[PDB]
């Protein structure tokens, strides 16, 4: 069910604009929630005592 890493070839658009970038500008909006992992790290403050 991944949406990304796949070619999308445009040959018809539901607007009257056929993908023409007026003014040499273009926008791309992307959301995902499948790759949203959160790693946790530590760092010691005193590396001496074994306890």
């Amino acid at each position: 069910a991944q949406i990304f890493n796949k070619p999308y070839w445009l040959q018809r658009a539901q607007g009257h604009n056929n993908g023409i970038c007026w003014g040499n500008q273009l926008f791309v909006t992307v959301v995902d929630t499948t790759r949203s992992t959160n790693m946790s790290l530590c760092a010691a403050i005193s590396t001496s005592e074994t306890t």
Partner: antibody, heavy 120, light 110 residues
Framework: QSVKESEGRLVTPGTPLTLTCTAS????????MTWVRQAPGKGLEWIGI??????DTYYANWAKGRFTISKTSTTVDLKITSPTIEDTATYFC????????????????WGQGTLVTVSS | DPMLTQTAASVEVAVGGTVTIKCQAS??????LSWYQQKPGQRPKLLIY???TLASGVPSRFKGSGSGTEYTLTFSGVECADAAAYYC????????????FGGGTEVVVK
């Protein structure tokens, strides 16, 4: 909030001795408890510690074999096994206000403290 | 064993002076450190913990700084009821130590 003690006694060396410590508002199974001893001159000496759900204890270096800290859900107390002459001083019971990780030795809300003395 | 010595008897100060009490530690304790005022007739009473965060019901004219192994406690505008005893105290909760977190005094202010 307020921390209460048991009333002091003038005792003889060679007799076991107790002091109970009850709290007013908070429950004691959440926080930690410890004991400090205020001697004349300077003296201000910490005894040990006891934790909440782990229920572990750690004493001072000189204080092993000499104090046993007991705790129920309603009351904490400490015990003395064999008193020596020079422990005529002032004892205090206080709550360790800590956070999710520390259990560091901040004693935020103290007790009023009573006078215990030994004499022969 | 982390040890804070506090071998410093306090100097005579007037109304409005500034006092630098310095508490040094042998081992690194992080920021976990407390301070107390002991009036010589009643129970001890705490001002600041973790060297930066003051307690409730205490004016903001007391200061806190220091990191690592050495720490300080300064304030200014000494009142009449500041004649007490002071104590720095660590929170490294170790087992084989015999801390007592001792040292510290304060003269009667003129």
């Amino acid at each position: 909030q307020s921390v209460k003690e048991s009333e002091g006694r003038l005792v003889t060396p060679g007799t076991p001795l107790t002091l109970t410590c009850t709290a007013s508002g908070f429950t004691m199974s959440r926080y930690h408890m410890t004991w400090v001893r205020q001697a004349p001159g300077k003296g201000l000496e910490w005894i040990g510690i006891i934790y909440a759900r782990n229920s572990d204890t750690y004493y001072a270096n000189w204080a092993k074999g000499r104090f046993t800290i007991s705790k129920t859900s309603t009351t904490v107390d400490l015990k003395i096994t064999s008193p020596t002459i020079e422990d005529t001083a002032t004892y205090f019971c206080a709550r360790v206000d800590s956070d999710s990780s520390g259990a560091f030795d901040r004693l935020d809300l103290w007790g009023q403290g009573t006078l215990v003395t030994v004499s022969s | 064993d982390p040890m804070l010595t506090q071998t410093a008897a306090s100097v005579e100060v007037a109304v409005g002076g500034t006092v630098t009490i310095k508490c040094q530690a042998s081992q690194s304790i992080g920021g976990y450190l407390s301070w107390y005022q002991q009036k010589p007739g009643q129970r001890p009473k705490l001002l600041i913990y973790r060297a930066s965060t003051l307690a409730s019901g205490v004016p903001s004219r007391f200061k806190g700084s220091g990191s690592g192994t050495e720490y300080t406690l300064t304030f200014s505008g000494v009142e009449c009821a500041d004649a007490a005893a002071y104590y720095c105290q660590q929170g490294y909760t170790s087992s084989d130590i015999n801390n007592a977190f001792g040292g510290g005094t304060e003269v009667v202010v003129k």
